[PDB]
């Protein structure tokens, strides 16, 4: 069987082709006194924790090699030389990094066959639509990738540096403003948990602000690991609002809805209708409740009234990229697309540009 590996800035998703869900999901981090994954986070006190993938781009290739080695040997417990490996890359990744992926897979892991797919087109595969725009928001970066008939349009791609890690830091600040203690480096994981459990997106931010200031019925309580319980309210939606109002963080940029509208407008006039009809949200940072309706109302405000807006947010959109990778690797037509060992030997690491798109 083929191996589908989605390497993300925050957590790596790995598994076998055709499966419904990834077999293993673990944080993408290397710890040196080399320990990778939840073993590294278990040993924060003795290891120097570094993330190799920043905004979807590989920085330290040795750390990435170690992450892939840990994946293949400990996570899936398979031999890389036996299985084809389908990797994912972030959009607008440098050419040299895509070459390095190819070289590492063929020369260090001796994989039989390899392919590199763009993460947005895999999210679109999981959506099951030919033409659409993907708003994938992960840990460190948010992209808006318009795709026409399965071919990504690199020129219309727009990138936003706001993502779930900055939202974790903003909820940490807001909790400190409420007077709770979270500033130390481990308690950041508790802010992450309360963000994943209690946060929600307001349909109308000023109405929710006024109601939560006027009434306490919107407040909810969360139990800290040490037994203390805190009540958070109004704060439950101020954090996700930073996606739509990045000025909360001090970043002078457009919101995710505005970025999506600008990326759509960068495309041809005729294909814009299909993009509006298929606005696909993927990534963990899009898992907040009500984000589909808020995005619908914002895009409807921006888009022409004669244009039909339809946000697609399946319940499984946190893994949409890997589900799409798995669907692609299980296809009969895809089998001709594998870079073979012989092709690499005869054409070099630049073969990835000749075959993969």
């Amino acid at each position: 069987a083929a191996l589908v590996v989605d390497n993300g800035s925050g957590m790596c998703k790995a598994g076998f082709a055709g499966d419904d869900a990834p077999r293993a999901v673990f944080p993408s981090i290397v710890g040196r006194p080399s320990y990778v994954g939840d073993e590294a986070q278990s040993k924060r006190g003795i290891l120097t924790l570094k993330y190799p993938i920043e905004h979807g781009i590989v920085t330290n290739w040795d750390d990435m090699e170690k992450i892939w080695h840990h994946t293949f040997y400990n996570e899936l417990r398979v031999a890389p030389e036996e299985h084809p490996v389908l990797l994912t890359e972030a959009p607008l990744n440098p050419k040299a990094n895509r070459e390095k992926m190819t070289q590492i897979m063929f020369e260090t892991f001796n994989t039989p066959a390899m392919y590199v797919a763009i993460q947005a087109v895999l999210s679109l595969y999981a959506s099951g639509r030919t033409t659409g725009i993907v708003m994938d928001s992960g840990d460190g970066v948010t992209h808006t990738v318009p795709i026409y008939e399965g071919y990504a349009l690199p020129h219309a791609i727009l990138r936003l540096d706001l993502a779930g890690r900055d939202l974790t830091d903003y909820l940490m600040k807001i909790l400190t403003e409420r007077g709770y203690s979270f500033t130390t480096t481990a308690e950041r994981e508790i802010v992450r948990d309360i963000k994943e459990k209690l946060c929600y997106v307001a349909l109308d931010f000023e109405q929710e602000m006024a109601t939560a200031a006027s009434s306490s019925s919107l407040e909810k309580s969360y139990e800290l690991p040490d037994g203390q319980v805190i009540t958070i309210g109004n704060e439950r939606f101020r954090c996700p609002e930073a996606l739509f109002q990045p000025s909360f963080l001090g970043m002078e940029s457009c919101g995710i809805h505005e970025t999506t509208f600008n990326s759509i407008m960068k495309c041809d006039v005729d294909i814009r209708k299909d993009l509006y009809a298929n606005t696909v949200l993927s990534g963990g940072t899009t898992m907040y409740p009500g984000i589909a309706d808020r995005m619908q109302k914002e895009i409807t405000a921006l888009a022409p009234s004669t244009m039909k807006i339809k946000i697609i947010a399946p319940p499984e959109r946190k893994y949409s990229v890997w589900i799409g990778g798995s669907i692609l690797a299980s296809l009969s037509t895809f089998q001709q697309m594998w870079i073979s060992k012989q092709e690499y030997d005869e054409s070099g690491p630049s073969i990835v540009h000749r075959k993969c798109f």
Binding site: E343, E346, S347, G348, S350, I351, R354
Partner: protein, 45 residues
């Protein structure tokens, strides 16, 4: 050879990586050339 079918009008061109590519030209009679079993090239050892 695979498939044993006339692919119609083609030309052999070397690609960037040394990969030999068959460029293909559209013709109105392409379906007839598909049913087919003029200068008509065939591969041989």
């Amino acid at each position: 050879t695979v498939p044993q079918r006339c692919i119609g009008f083609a030309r052999r061109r070397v690609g960037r990586g040394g990969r030999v590519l068959l460029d293909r030209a559209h013709s109105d009679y392409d379906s007839v050339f598909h049913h087919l079993d003029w200068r008509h090239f065939r591969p041989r050892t």
